């Protein structure tokens, strides 16, 4: 649950503790992005917040341009490299973890996402599809 | 400012054909469309608004749409019937064909 | 907006078809809330209720005097 | 969130139950009733 | 003191006592109101588990997400062969 | 409620006329009426909206 | 009562595709367990004195007695259970050949998976298929009941139609669905010829 | 022409929608009252069909053709295929891709005539685009933008290339096209306008917070209302200059 | 409805069932059990393994090409629905299966 | 921020104001201490009451320190306006007040805190904490009048126009009654008296409309006449500042 997001979002297995880094997805130039917290987390004593494939996430450029650097952004994942039952009744998972930064509104920041993205994030958000060059 | 306008331009600056040599690319503007009546909310005769059928309905949240009987067929006794998709494994999607 | 917006409407039919009727009646009404929040008052509350009567007791002899 | 026990939303059931509802469980008991005698009337039969 | 950190408490307190089932065929607590009017028809069934079993349908759920699409979904196969009266047992209502 | 009859008034645009032989129900209804309408989460001073009572006179009326 | 003394009655005559109906039944055993799955308590960190599988404290130095609330490792499983809102997805009948048939798959195979349901024997008789998990295991007693009110929710009112029914042996990682088209994928074998 | 229009919540009606001169397309998802906007300009006079793309709502994004023909991400289940075609008319062909590229709204953009791929894609799939729409293919990239097909909405009577276009670019284009393109915006700026709208050779719907000098530009550079053939922009040549 | 023959085996994928890896190049890599599954992330050649259905159809062995095989293509054709040519086709699948 | 601050955190008056702090520092504190406690925890309790106090204090005096829009450095128009309409010196003198009690607030709680770690007995941290609380509320009680000022001025202040400079404009004038209201009601859908009487609106009007595909905002003014640039109004003034800050027309 969270804003900016088109449609209501299904539980999928989460895969992304705060903390955890990602291969950056786009062309923004970041190397790398470093979770730092889960926007709309549940929030549960002793329990680390974690993410999902499709979700927003604030997270530091842990590498790459030092401009964006030094700072958080929110990011949405592209890939989450654990396994989740989609609901067409076939799991599956990514090579390896992934995401992009993008603004509160959810527009994408960078021209174009490198990669296969999955299509539970293509399909909550519109920009991240009209971004993406090719679902899963 | 004599600035401003070499940024505009960009936009201002509407392409020309730049011929190469042509080959005809005419709109392709359906007679049926020519021939449509302009919808007219005001208008009883109106057509019937699948929105408001929807809305008849019970509307949006209990409706049940039928993507079946808006597609085309070679009959329509047969618009309702259900495809096999499967037959012993090996889909019969695979195994369709004319002839 | 942008105006006293609100005093305008006011002046058109204001404030309700029947605004008057309901404000008399809780007017009548108040000279009974007062014992009422004068007896069922408990607590801390019911100490700061006294000091303001007696202060408006004092203002009003004061301003009959 | 409205609570479970909140009376507007079961007010609100209560006011949704009234159609079809209620329609599908008179439709399903008589089907279900209709099924039964046909069960003890082919015990009957035998 | 207050513990520094609320959580929610750990099980259920409305399910115990936890001990185990007095017998292995669980009885009802309750059954459905008596509506006179309607046909006469059995409250419950008797039934054996069998196991459990994959299946897929296409949904019919407009306004959900997943609406027009197919949807695996488990169940719960549970052996039910015919039962058959063998008595009755009434009832009377009593202040107790 | 039970003896009290609705009726909406003739020739008179947007009114209703309860009427009844006791004033407890008609009273009542008259009560649930401007209850069941009342305005929420809204400002009243701007929102006129709502039922009102304007007469609670006889049926005669003139006698 | 009297008319149906000594008669069968079958499911279908108390019950319907996409009813909903209550499950109860008793929940498999675990036997003695402690706090920390019987009540999901957190374990200690690591190699604490006196154990590290319970709980760290069961009470304040007031009152000096043990709560009930203390979740005390005990008993688990064996519980009497009553689970409520399970659609039924198909009411089979023992009579029918191809129980498993359905407009698209269509196959002449039954529900039963390859081999036998696991721990259980094959099905020949009328069979409830409501959809979910239910209290219990495989040869536990199920008493099928009313959700005693009319709910009709959307979830309920909504009608299923199966595309698919799995029979997938589940002794173990079963891929065929009937024993012919095993043969069929694998061919004439060794034996057979 | 122009409609306003708006999907659940969403200016880009692109994503949600691939319009065509012979057909169109709305995902199945949400109320109605998507397929019914779209119903009330194109009306009854060509097929607007549900239809799903592996169930997302991003069909629009995830398909690419024109009036000769359509194409489907190799994803796509043999059902929601099966659907398209029997409901669209024969002469629309249809043929699934097995390319790499499966996102092929975004890959792939075209006109009755033209179409522009994405550089990198295999040669195949430019034969069996040509193969099936008719039109000539040319790879090609606007201004380093390598998704075509989300910065460069197209039509027989012109396009609209993303603003970020250097000028060269839009005349290379527009050799290239054969037809008239302007740089713009759509859905309040966004700077994707093949996503942010759908277009044909008399309709073209867009988001509801599109404003309206970027309406004016689109129903010009489209030619799609009467005395407005692409040469009103001289007279838009203060408001445009006020804008900005 | 769309069962995939194994990656590794060649065997049938149902609904509900095995593991799809996703590589970065962008096409799936079906496995219908965990065995396959785990075999493609050791590198293992399907070809050299024995169970394989694929070093069966490399040893010369079970008609690894038959004519009753040209039915099994994965047609993109979206040729039109007919009950006609459904009931002709659930004949012709079943004959073709007892000739194979 | 600019363009109608509507987001004025609601200043109270100093009596109110004053009642709500005392009330939330006696509600969400601890309360019960006994003698017999350890004079460390009776030293942090006080200590925790007189901290809180001051901190609710410092946020009720900060939040409209914030929440004010700074009539300097914001535009020469909305200066001129706002100096025409809230006296601007008696404005800043307000919100310096305000500053001035924080300042207060926060150097007693402050030497409080300070004396408090050093009492012996349960009497003496006692009446430390009611002498802080009593220095608070005697410099709440002087802000009075300035506060009730500022709760005036937001409630005028609130409902002025929206209005952008930059962007284009349109400023009507004339002499009352002249019918500049009726042209503003008729080339706009904003609604304003047109009632005979000379100066039927009070205060400056907008009115949105569009053309030539571009946003325009008629702007009436509250009339104007013939006076030696000294013997008028405020709102005269407050014209007269609309149209000399106002180009286009
Ligand atoms: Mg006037
Ligand atoms: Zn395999």
Redesign the pocket.
Known sequence: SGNGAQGTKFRISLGLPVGAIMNCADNSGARNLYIIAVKGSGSRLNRLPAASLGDMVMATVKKGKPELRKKVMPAIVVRQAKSWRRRDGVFLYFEDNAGVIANPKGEMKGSAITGPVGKECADLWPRVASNSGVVV | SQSRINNVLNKIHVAQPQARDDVKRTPFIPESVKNLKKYDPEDPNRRKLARDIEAENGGAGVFNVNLKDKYLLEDDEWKNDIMPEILDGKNVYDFLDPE | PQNDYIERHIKQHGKRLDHEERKRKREARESHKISERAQKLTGWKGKQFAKKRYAEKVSMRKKIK | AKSLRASSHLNAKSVKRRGVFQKAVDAREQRISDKLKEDLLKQKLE | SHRKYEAPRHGHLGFLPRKRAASIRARVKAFPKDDRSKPVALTSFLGYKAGMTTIVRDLDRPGSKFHKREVVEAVTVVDTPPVVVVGVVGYVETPR | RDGVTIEFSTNVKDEIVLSGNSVEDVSQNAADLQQICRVRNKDIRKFLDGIYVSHKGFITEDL | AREHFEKTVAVDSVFEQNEMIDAIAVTKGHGFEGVTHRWGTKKLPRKTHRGLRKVACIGAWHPAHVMWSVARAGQRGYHSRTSINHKIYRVGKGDDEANGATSFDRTKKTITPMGGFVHYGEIKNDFIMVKGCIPGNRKRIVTLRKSLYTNTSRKALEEVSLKWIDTASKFGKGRFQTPAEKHAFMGTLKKDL | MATRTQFENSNEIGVFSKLTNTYCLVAVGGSENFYSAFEAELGDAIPIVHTTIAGTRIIGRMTAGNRRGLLVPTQTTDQELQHLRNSLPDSVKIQRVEERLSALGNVICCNDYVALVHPDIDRETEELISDVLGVEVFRQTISGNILVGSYCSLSNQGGLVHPQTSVQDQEELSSLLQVPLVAGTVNRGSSVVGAGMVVNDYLAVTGLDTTAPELSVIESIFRLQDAQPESISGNLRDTLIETY | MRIYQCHFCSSPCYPGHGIMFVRNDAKEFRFCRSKCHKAFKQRRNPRKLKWTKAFRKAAGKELAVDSTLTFAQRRNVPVRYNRELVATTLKAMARIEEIR | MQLSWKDIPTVAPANDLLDIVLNRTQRKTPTVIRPGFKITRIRAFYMRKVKYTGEGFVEKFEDILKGFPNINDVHPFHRDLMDTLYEKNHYKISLAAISRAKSLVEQVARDYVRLLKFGQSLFQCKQLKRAALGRMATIVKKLRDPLAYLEQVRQHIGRLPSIDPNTRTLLICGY???????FLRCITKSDV?????????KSLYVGHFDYKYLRFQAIDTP?ILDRPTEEMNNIEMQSIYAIAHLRSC
């Not at chain 10, 009352?176 to 009726?182: A, I, R």
């Not at chain 10, 008296?193 to 609106?201: G, N, R, W």
């Open positions: 009352p009654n002249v019918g500049k209201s009726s008296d047109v009632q005979p009487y000379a100066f039927t609106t009339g």
